[PDB]
């Protein structure tokens, strides 16, 4: 059975309980926490690529008012569907299953200015999604794995002081 498990789920849930925020910048910013997953049930002999994209969690934008996140507007036109290819791709099933798969180098941006970055809209909520694909597969089989523990709001600057403090404590 294919099984994809979120690593450091307790750490993600500490951020999610505050409402998680990730900074987006012109030139792009790495995530904290880093999305990491454990994988079993691939064919160890087959080759696969790991892809990451970000799905809009909501049909509205958000704002931080009186220490709380609340609806802040109609949603802006959706960011383009940017896909990050895990840099170990393509690789054997055995490679992906021997140790957790870490998306440490993905960068979130608010400007289409190159570098294989992911464009997000500030003050919109996103859910990370991992895709597995098999090299050679005539079926072009894709799996999709959603991690609701890792939902966050994209911001140009941290709104919640408790998030600023969590990011410093655990990073
Ligand atoms: O080996 C395959 O057929 C395959 C194809 C696309 C994605 C995952 C796959 O691995 C598994 F889900 F475990 F089957």
From Swiss-Prot:
Domain of life: Eukaryota
Membrane-spanning segments: none
Subcellular location: Nucleus
Residue spans binding DNA: 11-171
Tissues expressing the protein: Detected in testis, but not in other, normal tissues. Detected in lung tumors (at protein level).
Assembly and interaction partners: Monomer.
Role summary: Involved in the transcriptional regulation of genes required for mesoderm formation and differentiation. Binds to a palindromic T site 5'-TTCACACCTAGGTGTGAA-3' DNA sequence and activates gene transcription when bound to such a site.
Disease: Neural tube defects: Congenital malformations of the central nervous system and adjacent structures related to defective neural tube closure during the first trimester of pregnancy. Failure of neural tube closure can occur at any level of the embryonic axis. Common NTD forms include anencephaly, myelomeningocele and spina bifida, which result from the failure of fusion in the cranial and spinal region of the neural tube. NTDs have a multifactorial etiology encompassing both genetic and environmental components. Chordoma: Rare, clinically malignant tumors derived from notochordal remnants. They occur along the length of the spinal axis, predominantly in the sphenooccipital, vertebral and sacrococcygeal regions. They are characterized by slow growth, local destruction of bone, extension into adjacent soft tissues and rarely, distant metastatic spread.
Protein name as annotated: T-box transcription factor T
Species this chain originates from: Homo sapiens (Human)
Residues of the full protein shown: 41 to 211 of 435
